[PDB]
C-alpha cells in the first residue's frame, strides 16, 4: 500500500477494420511482450547498479544461527533480532535457506523455543514465529 | 453523432494508424469548472465569513493522505456478505 | 610464420 | 559542489592550468520548467538530494550524477531537505499544505509520512477510551489521530464543504460527523 | 592539494570443402559427410504529364520509403517519362514488395496525395476502386457538370463527408472517380457516389452517411 | 558571463554584444555624448569603451 | 530455363476468373474462380476470394512446369466499367507473391469504338 | 516445400527441412537410409534419413526432374544415382 | 582575494562562430536522388 | 583412471560403486576421490547421478578431464586451438630448458632467452599457450626446415611429430562424437592449421582449461591470509607461495604452500604474479619446495562461471545494501546480487575455500534451493 502511484511502418491490421470481411465470414482471425520487456528492466536494473565493494559471505545475523546451533546458545542472535529493524527481521526471517536437511529452519526454531523460556520479549518472540510460518 | 465535412488533417494511414493504439477533454471541462467553482467559492465566502479563510491551493507520486491505515489491507475492509 |  | 537555481552542479578541484580552482565537470538537471527549491548534501555517501519546485525530488550519486530515484509528493514546492546523520534516511517537507516525509531510500521504506489540515480545525473528538482523537476542518476533510503515537492513521474526505461536529458513539467503533455541504 | 584539505580487473567476456569418400558402418550402411551449405524483377508506371510538376515536387518525399522500407531500386526515366522499380535481389526482402511499391506509385499517378498513398505501403488490405460518370448515367453537356458538382459539393464539402464516413479518399477527375480504401469501406463511398450522379441532392445523401459513420463506429 | 549586450525596443536581439569582464557585470556607465562607456565587472576589473 | 504462361485475369463486379494458359492463349494449364473459393455469393469477388483463387493457381503452375507468366488484366468493358476492380489487383499482388516470374502486364479491356444502349435505361442504374 | 521425416515407431516427426522448390519425385535407397528429392527447378537433393542432413546437392539438370534411381549395396563402394 | 569562474571567452567564441554561420551565404544541395539515374540499395 | 571406471558404471545406473564387488577392487579413498572429481567435472550432480555433460564424456575414450576440455571447446572456432594443447600434454613437454642443457657459451644462453621469448608473444602470465603457440608454429615449417627449426629453437623433433599426429586423430574422437556426421568425418591438415587467436579468443581458452582442471587452482597466499607469509617488491617471483584449492589446513600454514616453477614464463616477469593461478600438477621432486605445473591464470568471474557447473562453488543469500535492490519475478525467479565462495564452506574449517567478487545472477528456485542459471 506504500508503493508509489505509476509505431512500426508496416502496420499488421486486418479483418473487418481494415474492410475484410470475407476474411471473417470464412473464418480466419503482447503480454508476452510486455513480460519480455519485463525481463529487459530486470537486466536493465542490474546494470545500474555495479557496485564492486568487497563484502562478506554470510550476513551478520546468519553467522550467529550458525555459531548458536554450535555453542547451543542463541542469545547472541536473539539480542540482534530484538534489535533489527522491522524491515531487516522480516528480510532475515525469508531469507532462512529451505533446502535439506532444513539447518536453518530448526535453528531459529531452537533459538525462538529458548527465547520462550526467558519469559522475556515474548510478544516479538511470538511474532517471529508467526512470520515463521508465514 | 456529427460527421465532418472539412477535410481531415489526419492522412488514411493516421486514421489506421491510431486505431492501432468518458473523454479527456470532456474531463479537460470538468477540470476547469472545478477550479472555477472553486475560485469563486473562495471569493464569496471571503465577503460573508466572520473568520479569516485562507486561499485555495511522468514521474511516480507519493500519496501523502491516505483513506484507510497503511497496515490495512483492502480485503480485510469487505464484509462476509459482501464476499 | 604468424606464430614466429 | 555547487549548486544552482537553473538546474546546473558544478564540480571544482584545484588543479594545475599555478594552481587554481576550477570546473572541471558540469552536470544538469533537465527539469522541463521546475526550479531547484532546496538542496542537500551528505558527504560521506555521498548523496545529493535535491527538491524541485514541481513537488518533486531527485536523489544523486556526486561525482558520477547517478540519479538513485525520482519521486513526486505533489504540485507544490519541496521547502526543505534534510539527511539524516547516517545518510539513511531523508526528510522532505512541503509548507503549502504542511506536508512532512521521511523516506528510507536504502528500503525504499517510509518511517513518517503525515499531512496536516489545510483550514483550522472546528471540532474534534475523542475515542470514548481516549486511545484515538478525530479531527473535522473548515476543509471538509475528517482525519483520524493516535494519542500515543500523535500521527494520523486515516483521512477521510467524504465531505464537500466544511465538516461542523464530529461524534462519537459509546460503543465507540462508530464515529458520526455533520456537514455544512448538507449530509450526516 | 587544495587548500581545504583536512589538517585485479575481472574479465567481462565469459564462455557460453565435402569430402569425396564413403564410409561403411557395421550394417553395411554407407555413411557421406554434409554437402557444402528474391528475384530479379522490374516494374513501370508511366506518369501523365499534369502529375510531372507534383511528381517532382513530392520526389523527396517517394523515393525514402521504397528505398529504404521497401528496399527496392528506384529511378523516374526522363526520355520515358515513367517511374522505374527493380528488386535488388542481394538487398530486397519481401517477395510483395515490388507490386506493392508498384501501387503506390500509381495511386500518385492517378491524382492521391502522397500521405495518402502511402497507406498502400503501410497497410496490405487497400484497393483503389475506379469507374465513370458515363456508366452509371449518360449525363451531357450540363447536366453532366452539375453531377460532378454534385459529387465535390460546395468547398468540397460533400466529397470530404463521403472520405470522413465511410474512412476512404476520394480522387474526382473530371468525369472519372478513384475511389482508395478497404474494400468493404470503397463499395460503401461507391454507393453514395452513385446516388449523387442518380441525381440525389447532398442533403439527403449526407444523412444517409451519418446513418452509416454512427455504425462503423460501434463495430 | 561578462558580455554587455545592446537592445532597441523594435528589435528582437541585442544589436550588439562586448564581453567586458571574466565575471558578472555589476555597473555600467555612459557618457552625456555617447561615446564612451564603463564597466566593472566582479573580478576587481574595470574597463573603458569606445562604443 | 524459364519456360513463360499467360495469366489471363478476369475481375467482374461479381467474380474474378484467374486463368493461365500458354503463350499462344488455345491451351488452358489452370482456371480457378473466386467462387470456387468462398462459401456465400456475397464474398465470390472479394479481394479475399480472388487471392485463394491466384495461389491455387499458382501451384498448378508450378507444377506443369511454368515458372514465368504474362499478365493480362481485363475488367467486363464493353457497355460497362472499364477498369479491373480490387479483386483482380488482389490477384495480381498474389501471384507476385507466389515466386512466379511476373513478365509483362496489360491492360486488355474490351473498349467500344461505339456501344450499344447500356442497361439501366434513361434514369441510370446501380442504386 | 518441407521435406518431413516421419518415425514410425517413435510415430513423431523426427526432421523437417526447407527444399528450394516443390518436389514430385522421391526415391529411397534399398539400404533405406538415403532420400533423393527432384524438383522442379532441376536440382536434385539427398538426405540422410536417419541423421537427417543433406549429403549431395546436384545442380546439373536443366528440366524438372521426373525421375529418381538409387543403386546400392550392403558394404559396397559403389552408390549411384540416375 | 581570489576569483574563480566559468571560461567567458570560450563561450563568447562559440556563440560568434554561431552568430558568423548563420548570416553568412549557403550551398544547398538540391540535387534529386533517382531522378534520372538509378538510385537505391544497389547503387 | 579410476574416474574413467566410476563415469562408466555412473552411464551404466550402478549406483553403489564403494560397495560394488570387483573381481580386483579399487581403493575406497581412490573411488571416493574419484566421484568426487566428476562431481567438480559436472559429470555427476549433487546426488552423483550421471548427467548430459556426463553422458557425452562416457563415450569418450579419453581421460574424463579432457573429455571435458574437449567439449566445452566449440565455440569461436577454438577447438583447433584446444586440440593442440590436449595434444601436446598428452605426449609430453617439447621444451628443452636451459638447466637440461647446462647453461642456467653466454651466446647461447642469449639465443636460448630468444627462442623463448619468441613464443611467449600470446600470453605473459600463460605457460600452455606456449605450448599452443610451437606446436601451431609447427604446420608452418615446411619439411625441408623442420631440423632446423629443432636445432634452432631447442625442441625436441621425435616429440613434436608425435604431437602433429595426434593432433589429426583427436580432432576425429571429437568431430565423431559432436558433429551429426559421427562416423562420416574426415579431418583435413587445413583443419587443424589456424591463424593467430584473438584476445577474445585467448580469454575464452583459459576458460576452456579451466573446465577440466578446475580442482586443480590454488590463489596467492597473501590474498587469503595477509601478513602471513611475508610478501614484498623485492622478493623473487619464485619465492611467492600459493595454496591450492582443497588443500588441508595445517596447523602452520607454511606447509601447505605450492611455488612456481624457475621454468615457467612467469619468472622472468618481474612484476608481481597472479592471484588465481590453474596448475596441470603439483611436483615434490625437489626439495626446495613443491613446485606448480602451471597452465595459466584466471581471472574471478571467469573462474566461477567454470565452477559453476560443478558442486565446487557456492552461492549466498542475495546481497542488500545502497543499489543491491534483489529484482523478484516470480515466486520461483529472481535476480539479484551474490557474493560466490569457491572450495570449501566457511562452515568447514578443514579445506581452503575462498570468496570470489559478488555478481548479479539470474537464480530460479528449484527442489527449495536457489540454483543459478546464468551470469548478468
Ligand atoms: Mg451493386
Known amino acids: 500500500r506504500s508503493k508509489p502511484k505509476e509505431l512500426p511502418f508496416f502496420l499488421q491490421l486486418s479483418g473487418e477494420k481494415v474492410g475484410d470481411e470475407a476474411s471473417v465470414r470464412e473464418g480466419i482471425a503482447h503480454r508476452r511482450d510486455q513480460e519480455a520487456q519485463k525481463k529487459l528492466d530486470a537486466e536493465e536494473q542490474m546494470n545500474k547498479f555495479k557496485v564492486t565493494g568487497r563484502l562478506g559471505f554470510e550476513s551478520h545475523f546468519t553467522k550467529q544461527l550458525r555459531e548458536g546451533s554450535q555453542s547451543k546458545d542463541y542469545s547472541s542472535l536473539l539480542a540482534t533480532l530484538i534489535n533489527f529493524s522491522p524491515a531487516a527481521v522480516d528480510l532475515e526471517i525469508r531469507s532462512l535457506n529451505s533446502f535439506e536437511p532444513f539447518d536453518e529452519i530448526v535453528w531459529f526454531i531452537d533459538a525462538l523455543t529458548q527465547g520462550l523460556k526467558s519469559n522475556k520479549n515474548f510478544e516479538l518472540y511470538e511474532t517471529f514465529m508467526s512470520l515463521l510460518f508465514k | 453523432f456529427e460527421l465532418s465535412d472539412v477535410k481531415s488533417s489526419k492522412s488514411l494511414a493516421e486514421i489506421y494508424e491510431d486505431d492501432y493504439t468518458l473523454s479527456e477533454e470532456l474531463q479537460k471541462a470538468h477540470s476547469e469548472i472545478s477550479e472555477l467553482y472553486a475560485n469563486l467559492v473562495y471569493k464569496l465566502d471571503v465577503l460573508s465569513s466572520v473568520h479569516f479563510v485562507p486561499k485555495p491551493a511522468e514521474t511516480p507520486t507519493i500519496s501523502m493522505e491516505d483513506a484507510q491505515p497503511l497496515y490495512m489491507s483492502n480485503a480485510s475492509s469487505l464484509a462476509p456478505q459482501e464476499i | 610464420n604468424p606464430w614466429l | ?184 | ?219 | 558571463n561578462g558580455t554587455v549586450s545592446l537592445w532597441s525596443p523594435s528589435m528582437p536581439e541585442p544589436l550588439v554584444k562586448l564581453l567586458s569582464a571574466r565575471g558578472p557585470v555589476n555597473s555600467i556607465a555612459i557618457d552625456r555624448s555617447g561615446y564612451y562607456m564603463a564597466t566593472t565587472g566582479a573580478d576587481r576589473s574595470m574597463k573603458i569603451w569606445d562604443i | 530455363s524459364q519456360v513463360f504462361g499467360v495469366a489471363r485475369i478476369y475481375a467482374s463486379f461479381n467474380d474474378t476468373f484467374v486463368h493461365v494458359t500458354d503463350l499462344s492463349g488455345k491451351e488452358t494449364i489452370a482456371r480457378v474462380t473466386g467462387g470456387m473459393k468462398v462459401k456465400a455469393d456475397r464474398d465470390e469477388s472479394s479481394p479475399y476470394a480472388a487471392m485463394l483463387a491466384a495461389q491455387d493457381v499458382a501451384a498448378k503452375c508450378k507444377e506443369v512446369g511454368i515458372t514465368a507468366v504474362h499478365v493480362k488484366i481485363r475488367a467486363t468493358g464493353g457497355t460497362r466499367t472499364k477498369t479491373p476492380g480490387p479483386g483482380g489487383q488482389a490477384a495480381l499482388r498474389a501471384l507476385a507473391r507466389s515466386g512466379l516470374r511476373i513478365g509483362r502486364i496489360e491492360d486488355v479491356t474490351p473498349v467500344p469504338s461505339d456501344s450499344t444502349r447500356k442497361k439501366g435505361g434513361r434514369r441510370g442504374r446501380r442504386l | 516445400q518441407l521435406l518431413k521425416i516421419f518415425h514410425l515407431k517413435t510415430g513423431k516427426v523426427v526432421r523437417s527441412m526447407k527444399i528450394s522448390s516443390p518436389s514430385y519425385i522421391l526415391d529411397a535407397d534399398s539400404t533405406s537410409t538415403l532420400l533423393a528429392v527432384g524438383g522442379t527447378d532441376g536440382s536434385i537433393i539427398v538426405v540422410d534419413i536417419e541423421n537427417g542432413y543433406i549429403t549431395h546437392s546436384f545442380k546439373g539438370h536443366g528440366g524438372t526432374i521426373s525421375s529418381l534411381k538409387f543403386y546400392g549395396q550392403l558394404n559396397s563402394k559403389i552408390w549411384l544415382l540416375a | ?43 | ?376
Open chain 10, 1 to 376: 583412471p579410476v574416474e574413467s571406471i566410476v563415469l562408466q558404471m555412473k552411464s551404466m545406473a550402478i549406483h553403489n560403486i564403494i560397495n560394488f564387488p570387483f573381481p580386483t577392487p579399487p581403493d575406497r579413498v581412490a573411488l571416493s576421490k574419484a566421484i568426487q572429481l566428476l562431481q567438480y567435472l559436472g559429470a555427476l550432480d549433487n546426488k552423483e547421478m550421471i548427467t548430459e555433460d556426463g553422458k557425452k564424456m562416457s563415450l569418450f575414450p579419453l581421460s574424463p578431464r579432457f573429455s571435458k576440455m574437449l567439449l566445452v571447446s566449440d565455440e569461436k572456432a577454438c577447438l583447433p586451438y584446444i586440440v593442440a594443447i590436449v595434444s601436446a600434454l598428452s605426449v609430453g613437454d617439447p621444451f628443452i630448458n636451459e638447466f637440461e642443457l647446462g647453461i642456467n657459451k653466454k651466446e647461447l644462453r642469449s639465443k636460448f632467452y630468444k627462442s623463448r621469448s619468441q613464443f611467449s608473444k600470446l600470453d605473459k602470465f600463460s605457460d600452455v599457450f606456449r605450448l599452443l603457440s610451437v606446436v601451431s608454429a609447427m604446420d608452418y615449417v615446411p619439411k625441408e626446415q623442420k631440423e632446423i627449426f629443432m636445432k634452432k629453437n631447442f625442441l625436441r623433433g621425435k616429440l613434436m611429430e608425435e604431437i602433429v599426429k595426434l593432433r589429426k586423430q583427436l580432432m576425429y574422437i571429437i568431430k565423431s562424437n559432436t558433429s551429426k556426421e559421427n562416423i562420416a568425418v574426415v579431418i583435413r591438415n587445413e583443419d587443424l592449421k589456424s591463424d593467430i587467436p584473438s584476445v577474445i579468443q585467448i580469454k575464452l581458452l583459459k576458460q576452456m582449461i579451466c573446465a577440466g582442471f578446475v580442482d586443480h587452482v590454488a590463489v596467492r597466499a597473501d590474498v587469503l591470509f595477509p601478513d602471513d607469509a611475508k610478501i614484498t617488491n623485492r622478493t623473487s617471483i619464485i619465492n611467492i607461495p600459493y595454496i591450492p584449492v582443497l588443500a588441508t589446513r595445517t596447523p602452520n600454514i607454511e606447509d601447505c604452500f605450492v611455488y612456481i616453477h624457475p621454468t615457467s614464463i612467469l619468472n622472468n616477469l618481474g612484476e608481481m604474479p597472479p592471484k588465481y593461478m590453474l596448475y596441470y600438477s603439483l611436483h615434490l621432486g625437489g626439495n626446495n619446495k613443491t613446485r606448480m605445473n602451471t597452465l595459466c591464470d584466471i581471472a574471478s568471474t571467469p573462474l566461477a562461471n567454470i565452477a559453476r557447473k560443478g558442486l565446487l562453488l557456492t552461492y549466498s543469500k542475495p546481497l542488500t545494501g545502497q543499489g543491491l535492490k534483489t529484482v523478484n519475478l516470480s515466486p520461483t525467479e529472481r535476480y539479484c546480487y551474490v557474493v560466490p565462495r569457491f572450495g570449501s564452506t566457511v562452515d568447514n574449517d578443514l579445506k581452503i575455500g575462498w570468496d570470489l567478487n559478488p555478481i548479479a545472477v539470474h537464480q530460479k528456485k528449484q527442489k527449495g534451493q536457489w540454483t543459478v542459471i546464468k551470469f548478468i
Open chain 5, 1 to 219: 592539494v587544495a587548500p581545504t584539505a583536512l589538517k585485479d580487473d575481472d574479465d567481462d567476456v565469459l564462455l557460453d570443402h565435402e569430402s569425396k569418400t564413403v564410409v561403411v558402418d557395421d550394417q553395411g550402411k554407407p555413411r557421406f559427410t554434409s554437402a557444402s551449405k528474391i528475384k530479379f524483377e522490374s516494374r513501370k508506371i508511366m506518369v501523365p504529364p499534369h502529375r510531372m510538376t507534383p511528381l517532382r515536387n513530392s520526389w523527396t518525399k517517394i523515393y525514402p520509403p521504397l528505398v529504404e522500407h521497401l528496399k527496392l531500386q528506384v529511378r523516374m526515366n526522363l526520355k520515358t517519362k515513367s517511374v522505374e522499380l527493380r528488386t535488388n535481389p542481394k538487398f530486397t526482402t519481401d517477395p510483395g514488395a515490388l507490386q506493392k511499391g508498384a501501387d503506390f506509385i500509381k495511386a500518385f499517378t492517378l491524382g492521391f496525395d502522397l500521405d495518402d498513398s502511402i497507406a498502400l505501403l503501410r497497410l496490405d488490405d487497400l484497393y483503389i476502386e475506379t469507374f465513370e460518370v458515363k456508366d452509371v448515367k449518360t449525363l451531357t453537356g450540363d447536366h453532366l457538370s452539375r453531377a460532378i458538382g454534385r459529387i465535390a459539393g460546395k468547398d468540397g464539402k460533400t466529397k470530404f463527408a463521403i472520405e470522413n464516413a465511410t474512412r476512404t479518399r476520394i480522387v474526382l477527375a473530371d468525369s472519372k472517380i478513384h475511389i482508395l480504401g478497404g474494400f468493404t469501406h470503397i463499395r460503401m463511398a461507391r454507393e453514395s457516389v452513385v446516388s449523387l450522379i442518380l441525381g440525389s441532392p447532398p442533403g439527403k445523401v449526407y444523412g444517409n452517411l451519418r446513418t452509416v459513420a454512427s455504425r462503423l463506429k460501434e463495430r
Open chain 9, 1 to 43: 582575494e581570489a576569483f574563480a569562474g566559468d571560461d567567458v571567452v570560450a563561450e563568447f567564441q562559440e556563440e560568434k562562430k554561431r552568430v558568423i554561420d548563420d548570416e553568412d551565404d549557403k550551398e544547398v544541395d538540391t540535387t534529386l536522388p533517382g531522378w534520372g539515374e538509378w538510385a537505391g540499395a544497389g547503387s
Open chain 4, 1 to 184: 559542489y555547487t549548486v544552482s537555481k537553473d538546474g546546473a552542479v558544478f564540480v571544482w578541484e584545484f588543479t594545475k592550468r599555478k594552481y587554481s580552482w576550477r570546473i572541471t565537470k558540469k552536470h544538469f538537471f533537465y527539469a522541463n520548467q521546475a526550479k531547484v527549491k532546496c538542496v542537500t548534501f551528505h558527504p560521506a555517501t555521498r548523496l545529493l538530494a535535491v527538491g524541485f519546485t514541481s513537488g518533486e525530488f531527485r536523489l544523486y550519486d556526486l561525482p558520477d550524477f547517478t540519479l538513485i530515484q525520482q519521486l513526486s509528493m505533489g504540485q507544490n514546492p519541496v521547502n526543505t531537505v534534510s539527511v539524516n546523520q547516517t545518510g539513511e534516511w531523508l526528510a522532505f517537507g512541503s509548507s503549502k499544505l504542511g506536508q512532512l516525509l521521511v523516506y528510507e531510500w536504502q528500503s525504499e521504506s517510509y518511517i513518517l509520512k503525515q499531512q496536516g489540515h489545510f483550514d483550522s480545525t472546528n471540532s474534534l473528538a475523542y475515542s470514548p477510551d481516549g486511545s484515538r482523537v478525530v479531527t473535522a476542518s473548515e476543509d471538509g476533510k475528517i482525519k483520524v489521530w493516535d494519542i500515543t503515537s500523535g500521527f494520523c492513521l486515516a483521512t477521510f474526505e467524504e465531505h464537500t464543504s466544511s465538516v461542523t461536529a464530529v461524534q462519537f458513539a459509546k460503543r465507540g467503533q462508530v464515529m458520526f460527523s455533520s456537514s455544512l455541504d448538507g449530509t450526516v
